[PDB]
């Protein structure tokens, strides 16, 4: 179980960063949970998460800083409203819930950079 995502991303002057998280799957994973973590100065914390039912869109949790769209086995995650304080490594964790067997994957993480006008 390996999940890939961009190594580094530049947030536009508006403050909009986007990255895809595509994951390896045995095949036909009806339910999948995507979970984005922010690695700050030596600490990791969940900033957003969402379940992914096959044949339809995502369903993020309220107050999630992310919004995304599905496409087979990959989600196109975009986060808005960023400034220099939010610059860090955004790791995405993906796990196959149903049907079993259960798998768990964590990527290297997308290092999002931001600077304020």
């Amino acid at each position, epitope marked *: 179980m390996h999940v890939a995502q961009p190594a580094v991303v530049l947030a536009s002057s508006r403050g909009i960063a986007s990255f895809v998280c595509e994951y*390896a799957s*045995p095949g036909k994973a009806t339910e999948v949970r995507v979970t984005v973590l922010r690695q700050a100065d030596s600490q990791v914390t969940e900033v957003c998460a969402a379940t992914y039912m096959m044949g339809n869109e995502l369903t993020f949790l309220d107050d999630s800083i992310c919004t995304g769209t599905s496409s087979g086995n990959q989600v196109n995650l975009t986060i808005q409203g960023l400034r220099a304080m939010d610059t860090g490594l955004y790791i995405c964790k993906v796990e196959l819930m149903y*049907p*079993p067997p*259960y798998y*768990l994957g*964590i990527g290297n993480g997308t290092q999002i950079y931001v600077i304020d006008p």
Partner: antibody
Amino acid sequence: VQLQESGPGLVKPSETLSLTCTVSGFSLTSYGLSWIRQPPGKGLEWIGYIWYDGNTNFHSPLKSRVTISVDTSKNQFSLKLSSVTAADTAVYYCAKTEGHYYGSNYGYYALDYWGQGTLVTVSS
Amino acid sequence: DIQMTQSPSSLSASVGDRVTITCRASENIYSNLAWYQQKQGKAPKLLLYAATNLQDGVPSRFSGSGSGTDYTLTISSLQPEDFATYFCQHLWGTPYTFGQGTKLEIKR
């Protein structure tokens, strides 16, 4: 931790073969049970599986004929092969299928504990 | 669906030698591979899970390598007790197909 197969050594051709796999140390853990067979002097062949969900969703050359189930009360799983022929003479094993933590990921499954194996020779 | 092929079907090598068993998969399985040892008359015993990670009980002379499709075993300093028929199995797909198996012979 342990498990052993129980089945008749002989079964007549073109009638359903029925096995059982009495187990100990299962449940209280995310377990999965596989069934494997090995004809005489021949390589191993994976048949199917069944998980603690009760899910028996899989595919295999034998999926058409096999019917795996579980009797939770008696702590035994039951494989049932249909319309048997000389090709189905083999040693049938049941084996625990367990996942593993490797680095940040989890999965990397493998047949952890095997049974002794019961040999069944279809013949008239 | 995803088939496995080992080589060689059999081989010989004296005690103390270094021997390797290769096992190539059709598709990519991302190191979801298992190795097994079977001494006839007994059920097979799991040596390596996750391609490289060896099971607690197994000696250290057993070790695995590879990635993607091609994977291997290695027995640095072979012992007479290691006579068996070794099998590789992928567990990344609906049918967990085994390999044909290689028969290791001691040659005393």
